[PDB]
């Protein structure tokens, strides 16, 4: 369950080093303490070809355990998986659960309101349906109430004004009925009155059942949810769900207007595309932040489309000016809900590639890349009926290749990982509730790490902030090694940090950057190198192995490059006409001079892109981008202008602060990179430049 804490300081795993990422060496170092895997590094070295394919990223079951059967049982198999693969994790775990107490525990059970609508729901047992945002399980209750023919005393919550509900609550209880309390999660206070009514509702007619259409809220009555029966329901994940819902979102005759059949045809792809934009929740390779994928969006959209194509009929192709058709959906309808420039432009990129004059061809082409579960390539089912289009739709499932969103085969594995980290984090959040803590001082030695330019100004500010955070961290290192030791174990505000310490997490106060909690050792080495760069720049006028991401402010240093520019480039001039100029992975120009129009950036080391460049060109979607992320040794930068510069051959790759722009928006900059093709091609991937990975 633990990834370890001390993995990187220890010499990178020596024997197996051929095809293997460094993080893996760290993970196998952490594992090797295992008693079922002690010799594991030496073994995985000597015999390694099977282990080599093990890290040729075999999916399960092609990732089938290297059969070292001497120490090999199913629990050990998940140990192997987690230490090695982050897609096979859940699968192997479910396999173990099956081998323990049958697959019937991992086999899903269909969700429906038939096991206890009263069959186990006593008259004293109210029924509450935890709705997820989306579907309403009211329909099952309706079908039950029209087979039982029971009175359904529906009443709308979100408004305590319905004191009249009590008379319903009377006839529901006293006369005995199945009572609907819809939108109960919108209300909060009338909940208490219902609760105190129900705690005494055990003296009434038998047919008394409750049906509470509500969404769980932490601020809600504990006893009320305790007394009754809870049943949660989730929306059916899948494009087809959105497509059929959009069909029912539109009138079936509106879905059959052949008088504007092209518009009608348009509807389908619109009915299509609103699903597609709804799918990506997988940032930053998805969106920069989530957004409202509601259908009022779709409703207004289709309304205005009908407006446009009714101004002059849909059969007349010239009248829809597809630039305006994109503009309505992009600048105003959707972008207003959007808030991020890059999300906005990604959506606009959707707009042009899906809005154009040649779209009206019958059975228009949507996805030919996709060989699906039937190999079918997506097109338009031109046969005017809601039933026809829907029927065509369920011919293929809502589970398809991520590439259809411009993604790559890595994306599915990345989602598997995402699940793995979130799951294991929750598991570590719940285990110590029955395990205990405390192990004595974890005495670790990282505190022991302790010309005139504006570059030196940035230097000095970095030294100040690092000194601050260094000593502030040292405070708690004492408050652990000296609290239970030197009677200072009498304060408890800070102990949560020390609980994250003995449990590998990175607490809150020490966010000396937007560091992600992986291990203590990783962040310790991070800060170590951060101070080491200042050490070198103290002993070196300018280090040439310059590692950018040890900084505490990228903006300061990039601007510092710019005033150096003005000092010598716009010598006799002003910053008014200076713009960034970006180099490439295989260093095209490193240092040539420092005066007007000369190399006055620094050798920015180690920039990460799950995309890789050789021959000065960029390659994506292949096994190397499929590998988690692709490092970049070094490229240079400069600043110049006063003349137009066309990044025509260069993609405008953004560079945020850390692995996800999704988890937060500190967009450091944007850089030009030599893409030998069209740039909108890369936009759907949207592979930004990443400061570092862990």
């Amino acid at each position: 369950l633990k990834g370890g804490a001390a993995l990187d300081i220890n010499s990178v795993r020596k024997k197996p080093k051929d095809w293997i990422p460094d993080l893996v060496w760290l993970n196998i170092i952490a594992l090797s303490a295992m008693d079922a895997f002690r010799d594991i590094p030496d073994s995985v070295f000597r015999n390694d070809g099977l282990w080599r394919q093990w890290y040729d990223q075999e999916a399960p079951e092609m990732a089938k355990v290297p059969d070292y059967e001497d120490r090999l049982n199913k629990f050990e198999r998940m140990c192997v998986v987690k230490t090695f693969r982050e897609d096979r994790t859940l699968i192997a775990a479910a396999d173990y659960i099956a081998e323990a107490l049958g697959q019937r525990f991992v086999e899903s059970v269909p969700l429906n309101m038939e096991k206890r609508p009263g069959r186990r729901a006593m008259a004293k047992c109210p029924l509450i349906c935890l709705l997820s945002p989306g579907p309403d399980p009211t329909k099952l209750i309706e079908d039950l109430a029209k087979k039982k023919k029971i009175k359904t005393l529906g009443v709308s919550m979100g408004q305590g004004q319905e004191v009249i509900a009590r008379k319903h609550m009377a006839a529901a209880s006293l006369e005995g009925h199945w009572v609907l309390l819809q939108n109960t999660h919108l209300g909060l206070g009338y909940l208490t009155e219902v609760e105190t009514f129900l705690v005494k509702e055990e003296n009434v007619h038998e047919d008394f059942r409750l049906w509470i259409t509500a969404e769980p809220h932490p601020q809600f009555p504990i006893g009320l949810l305790q007394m009754g029966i809870k049943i949660t329901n989730e929306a059916p994940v899948g494009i087809k769900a959105g497509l059929r819902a959009s069909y029912q979102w539109v009138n079936q005759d509106m879905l059959d207007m052949v008088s504007r059949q092209e518009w009608r045809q348009l509807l389908f792809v619109m009915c299509f595309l609103h699903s597609v934009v709804q799918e990506p929740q997988f940032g930053p390779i998805g969106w920069n932040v989530p957004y409202e994928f509601n259908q009022s969006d779709l409703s207004a959209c289709v309304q205005f489309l009908q407006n446009h194509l009714s101004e002059m009929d849909a059969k007349k192709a010239p009248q829809p000016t597809w630039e305006t058709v994109r503009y309505m959906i992009s600048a105003i309808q959707y972008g207003s809900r959007i808030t991020d420039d890059f999300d906005k432009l990604l959506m606009d990129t959707f707009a042009e590639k899906y809005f154009l004059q040649p779209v009206l061809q019958p059975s228009y082409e949507l996805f030919k890349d996709t060989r699906s579960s039937d190999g079918f390539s997506y097109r338009v089912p031109d046969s005017t009926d809601i039933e026809t289009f829907g029927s065509y739709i369920e011919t293929l499932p809502g589970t398809e290749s991520p590439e259809i969103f411009g993604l790559h085969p890595n994306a599915d594995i990345t989602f598997r990982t995402l699940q793995v980290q979130e799951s294991i984090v929750t598991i570590l959040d719940t285990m110590p509730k029955g395990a205990g803590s405390g192990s004595g001082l974890s005495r670790e030695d990282v505190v022991d790490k302790i010309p005139t330019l504006p570059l030196t100004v940035h230097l000095r500010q970095e030294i100040d902030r690092l000194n601050i955070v260094t000593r502030l961290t040292t405070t708690t290192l004492k408050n652990l090694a000296l609290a239970i030791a030197g009677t200072i174990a009498a304060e408890r505000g800070l102990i949560d940090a020390l609980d994250a310490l003995f449990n590998a997490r990175i607490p809150q106060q020490w966010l000396s950057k937007s560091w992600e909690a992986s291990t203590l050792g990783n962040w310790f080495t991070g800060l170590l190198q951060r101070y080491d760069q200042l050490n070198k720049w103290l002993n070196l006028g300018r280090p040439k192995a310059y590692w950018m991401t040890g900084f505490f402010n990228p903006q300061g240093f990039l601007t510092a490059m710019k005033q150096e520019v003005n000092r010598k480039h716009r010598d006799k001039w002003a910053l008014d006409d200076v713009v960034m100029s970006s180099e490439v992975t295989h260093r095209p120009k490193d240092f040539e001079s420092l005066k007007e129009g000369a190399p006055e950036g620094v050798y920015v080391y180690g920039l990460y892109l799950d995309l890789r460049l050789d021959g000065r060109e960029n390659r994506l979607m292949d096994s190397d981008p499929k590998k988690l992320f692709n490092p970049l040794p070094v490229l240079h930068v400069d600043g110049v202008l006063a003349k137009d510069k066309k990044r025509s051959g260069l993609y405008e790759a953004p560079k945020p602060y850390r692995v996800k722009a999704r988890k937060g928006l500190n967009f450091i900059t944007t850089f030009s990179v030599r893409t030998e093709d069209d740039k909108s091609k890369w936009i759907l991937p949207g592979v930004g430049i990443l400061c570092s990975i862990d």
Binding site: G158, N307, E323, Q563
Partner: protein
């Protein structure tokens, strides 16, 4: 409710309707806000001055005299002649616009702006612009000539309006009119130029269509406004001025989005960062259509019934309203009222009955439209029910672009290089807020930008025929450095040279220099170049504000700086006398003038009476100087006198405007607790200690005392400053060091010995001078050492050859054998050494301060020498600052020492002198700000010999006659509080360590 139904317009105001019903005879009696209840700018109407029956012309909240097409005899039913007025404004709009277009040609064009109301002129401008701009296309006709000439149509008239702005004869009405027009004309440019950058296409190209246009179609009667798919008509409600904002691409995005929101008949939800014009854009666009918006507060009880009431008038008169802080309505209420008004909303759909707790029948005005602002969008949504977001379309906000705002301001300020000026000025502010050192006084917010730009525009308007670049440069350089610390000034000017090469700064009046030169040396103080430069800077700020401030480390004598300033001013017949109040030592509730929570008694303010004199004390000009740490608690109501209000609220505003006579000065040793919206509404003057350094005051004494001997100059830094920095760096004192105070201790000890030998026939020599020099600084530099750190002071110093007991043997050191005032020997318990110091202190009757043993032996020591005051009528009020000693404790304990003259003056009976002894004075607990208010009283009464009233709310003179002191405290450390620096300059400071183990053995054996 019946009357609200009678007249949908009335439904806006609250109980005012009763008062509305009270008025039954006289529309002249009708006055705002009643006249402002429905009308956005109208305030008054005038009638036939022989009968007052025919309504001649009107008056506005915008102060506009406007006639009407026909004087309507509007004196029937009050609400009925309310329509008789309402129709008038739209009728006037239509007809005045008709003649405006007719007399574009029938009469001239420059006065077309001034011969018509502000917006009336604006719409005419928009008409002509739209006409030419479509006729620029006109078919997409292939002739660049017409677009090219439209370029200069916009540009030449823009520079003509530049000339109009710079000419100093515009009425505030017309000035604001034209200034608003400036922004409209830049937008007209932006649009027309972007047309040329794009390919010129037909009058039906969606590029052209996408922008707003204004086609006066009198083919029915009136103008129709085209937005990108759809058309509307201006409301024609008289809107006066309603100074518009700048137009961003985001502005156009919002325009189109909210226009389509009407297409779905849906509301608009502008979500974005708080206080970013979210409601401002809505109101401005409504005025651009003419809709009288009524803002609606939320996050309250939020009486849903009352909004149900107003929805009648909304659906009937079709006007608009905006909500703010909607998401923080009471959760249960936030759902109840949301659902209730949600049901009402659907009355839009061609329906004529809104259903609510009233469920009543109404009429539908299609012009109605709903808009809501609130707290900033949180992660993509808010705390709102998921039906209004279905009823509404979002609208994304983001912080406006300062460059465009500065461009439009400077163009309104008569600038033409303005664009490229901003293209460096915004970058300049960005750099200044990036590279330099950052503190609270450092501010580059919007406030700073507006403040600099408004002044610069006036500067050019009064320095015309001048290059814009030079004026901008001089302004930005001038109003910035004085606020800033010294070391950034080189960096500041370096960035200046980057963004302005080949330019130069300004000059000021030099005659103020010579007067200060005269007075400073004339009064014996040291004159200093940088000091003089700061004097000039203060004189400059003296001509732009009335409230200035002097921040810096203590001992700089910021007191003395304003003293020299006032003296130099009065040299030229402009009097400015001062009064040194402590804005924290005396009590805060009496500081300012405040309001009680029971009834609001006029429990006076300490400065309330003084400002009362500032309104009723007129013979000259003066100053009012306030020394002490500055909180935010006696200021939050103070900028009203120094910001763009100029009237100081005593407790509610006492009408006393900018006092031409008296000004407010402040001397905070650190102004670091004011919000950067309160900051920069004062005269921000940083002062570094270098400006009167260590040596300049010693040379001031060289002027004052006899240079016939010129003793310290023999070792003026050859013995002092070297060891100063050496101990300050290589050694670790137990106390903060303000070197002005330390050199003060050195010189004061020297003068103590000087008095000892010049009043007593006790002899004098030159080797006498060398050894008294050694001994008068050794403890002045040994007063922060210990028994293991004083030797460090000794294992360094043998670089001099002046006889010492250290030069005698190794065990004995400098202190162990004192000097004699007669023969300068080394005489072989400890208390006496300090006592002579005390006596030397008693020679100037100015105390020193002690740290160390907590009453251990200092109680034994000091009292023996306090005993020796016998003939002065010395009332030895030993007043020790205790576990919690209040400033009132000192107040009475020294009131107890002396007689309370007048009840508002504190002096001894006649002039009899006394001693005041404090055992510990750093003992009292500070407040959260980190200062013992019970201590600044000590400074104020040491220096000024006067004070205002911490006892009395009024705040009035309390002159402190002659006194003298001796005091001490404990060592600084964990838990123990310390002393403000400006108080520390008043007293010497020296350390009492563990005593003399050898003398322990002596005194106890």
């Amino acid at each position: 409710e019946q009357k609200r139904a009678e007249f949908p317009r009335f439904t806006c105001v609250g109980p005012h309707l009763l008062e509305i019903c009270r008025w039954a005879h006289d529309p002249p009696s009708v006055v705002p806000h009643f006249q402002s209840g429905l009308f956005d700018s109208l305030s008054n109407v005038t009638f036939d001055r022989i009968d007052k029956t025919r309504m001649t012309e009107m008056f506005s909240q915008q102060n506009e005299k406007v006639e009407f097409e026909r004087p309507v005899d509007a004196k029937g039913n009050i609400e009925v002649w309310l329509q008789r007025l309402v129709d008038g404004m739209e009728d006037t709009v239509k007809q005045i616009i008709k003649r405006a277009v007719r007399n574009v040609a029938e009469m001239p064009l420059e006065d077309f702006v001034f011969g018509h109301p502000a917006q009336v002129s604006l719409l005419g401008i928009q008409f002509q612009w739209t006409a030419e701009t479509q006729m620029a296309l006109s078919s997409a006709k292939v002739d660049k000539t017409i677009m090219n000439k439209n370029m200069k149509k916009v540009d030449a008239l823009l520079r003509d309006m530049v000339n109009i702005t710079v000419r100093l004869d515009l009425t505030k009405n017309q000035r604001t009119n034209l200034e608003t027009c400036i922004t409209v004309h830049m937008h007209q440019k932006e649009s027309t130029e972007d047309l040329v950058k794009k390919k010129i296409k037909d009058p039906t190209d969606f590029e052209w269509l996408k922008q707003v246009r204004f086609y006066w179609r009198d083919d029915k009667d009136t103008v129709i406004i085209s937005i990108c798919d759809v058309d509307f008509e201006y409301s024609f409600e008289y809107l006066g001025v309603k100074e518009r904002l700048v137009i961003t691409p985001l502005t156009d995005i919002c325009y189109i989005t909210l226009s389509q929101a009407l297409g779905m008949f849906l509301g608009g939800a502008p979500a974005g960062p708080a206080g970013t014009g979210k409601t401002e854009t809505t109101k401005d666009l409504g005025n651009t259509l003419g809709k009288y918006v009524v803002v609606f507060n939320c996050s309250d009880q939020f009486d849903y019934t009352y909004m149900g009431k107003i929805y009648k008038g909304l659906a009937q008169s079709g006007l608009w309203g905006c909500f703010d802080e909607f998401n923080r309505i009471n959760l249960d209420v936030l759902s109840v009222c949301a659902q209730q008004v949600y049901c009402i909303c659907r009355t839009r759909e061609r329906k004529k009955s809104f259903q609510f707790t009233d469920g009543t029948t109404v009429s539908l005005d299609p012009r109605v439209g709903f808009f809501i602002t609130m707290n900033p969008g949180y992660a993509g949504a808010q705390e709102l029910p998921e039906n209004l977001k279905a009823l509404f379309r979002g609208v994304t906000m983001m912080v406006p672009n300062r460059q465009i705002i500065m461009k439009v301001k400077l163009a309104a300020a008569g600038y033409q290089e303005n664009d490229i000026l901003s293209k460096k000025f915004f970058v300049l502010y960005g750099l200044c807020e990036q590279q330099l050192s950052k503190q609270a006084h450092y501010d580059f917010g919007l406030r700073n930008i507006l403040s600099v730009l408004r002044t610069a525009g006036a500067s050019k308007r009064q320095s015309p025929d001048k290059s814009e670049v030079f004026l901008m440069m001089r302004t930005v350089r001038d109003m910035n450095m004085s606020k800033f610390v010294a070391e950034d000034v080189p960096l500041f000017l370096s960035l200046i040279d980057d963004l302005f090469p080949g330019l130069k700064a300004d000059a000021t009046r030099p005659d103020v220099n010579k007067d200060a030169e005269k007075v400073v040396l004339e009064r014996g103080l040291q004159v200093h170049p940088t000091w003089m430069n700061k004097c000039i800077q203060l004189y400059e700020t003296y001509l732009v504000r009335h409230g200035i401030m002097l921040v810096g480390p203590s001992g700089s004598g910021k007191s003395a700086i304003c003293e020299c300033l006032a003296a130099a001013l009065t040299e030229l017949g402009t009097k400015h006398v001062i009064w040194r109040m402590n804005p924290k030592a005396i009590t805060a509730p009496q500081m300012f003038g405040r309001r009680d929570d029971t009834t609001g008694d006029w429990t006076d303010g300490i400065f309330a009476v003084l400002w009362r004199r500032a309104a009723k004390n007129k013979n000259q000009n003066t100053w009012i100087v306030l020394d002490g740490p500055v909180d935010a608690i006696w200021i939050e109501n103070l900028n009203t006198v120094l910001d763009d209000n100029k009237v100081l609220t005593l407790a509610n505003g006492d009408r006393i405007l900018m006092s031409a006579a008296m000004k407010a000065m402040f001397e905070p040793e650190n102004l670091n607790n004011a919000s950067p919206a309160t900051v920069s509404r004062a005269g921000i003057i940083y002062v570094s200690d270098v400006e009167l350094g260590w040596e300049p005051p010693v040379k001031s004494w060289l002027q004052k005392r006899d240079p016939t001997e010129a003793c310290w100059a023999r070792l003026f830094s050859k013995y002092i400053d070297r060891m100063l920095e050496f101990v300050r760096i290589s050694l670790k004192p137990v106390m903060y060091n303000e070197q002005v105070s330390i050199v003060g201790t050195v010189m004061t000890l020297l003068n103590g010995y000087l008095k000892s030998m010049k009043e007593a026939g006790t002899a004098m020599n030159d080797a006498k001078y060398e050894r008294v020099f050694l001994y008068c600084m050794t403890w002045s530099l040994g007063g922060l050492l210990e028994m293991k750190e004083r030797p460090l002071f000794d294992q360094e110093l043998r670089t001099f050859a002046h006889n010492m007991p250290p030069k005698e043997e190794d065990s004995d050191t400098i202190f162990e054998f004192l000097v004699n005032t007669t023969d300068a020997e080394w005489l072989h318990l400890d208390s006496v050494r300090y006592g002579a110091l005390l006596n030397l202190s008693y020679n100037v009757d100015k105390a020193t301060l002690l740290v160390g043993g907590p009453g251990t032996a200092k109680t034994n020591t000091i009292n023996q020498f306090i005993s020796k005051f016998n003939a002065e009528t010395t009332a030895n009020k030993t007043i020790t600052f205790s576990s919690l000693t209040t400033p009132g404790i000192f107040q009475m304990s020294i009131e107890g020492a002396v007689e309370k003259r007048q009840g508002r003056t504190f002096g001894p009976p006649g002039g009899k002198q006394m001693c005041i002894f404090v055992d510990d004075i750093s003992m009292p607990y500070i407040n959260e700000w980190g200062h013992q208010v019970t201590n600044e009283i000590v400074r104020q009464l040491l220096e000024q010999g006067g004070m205002y009233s911490l006892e009395k709310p009024i705040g009035d003179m309390k002159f402190i006659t002659d006194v003298r002191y001796v005091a001490a405290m404990n060592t600084p450390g964990g838990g123990k509080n310390d002393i403000p620096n400006r108080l520390k300059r008043q007293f010497a400071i020296f350390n009492v360590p563990l005593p003399s183990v050898a003398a322990i053995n002596g005194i106890f054996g």
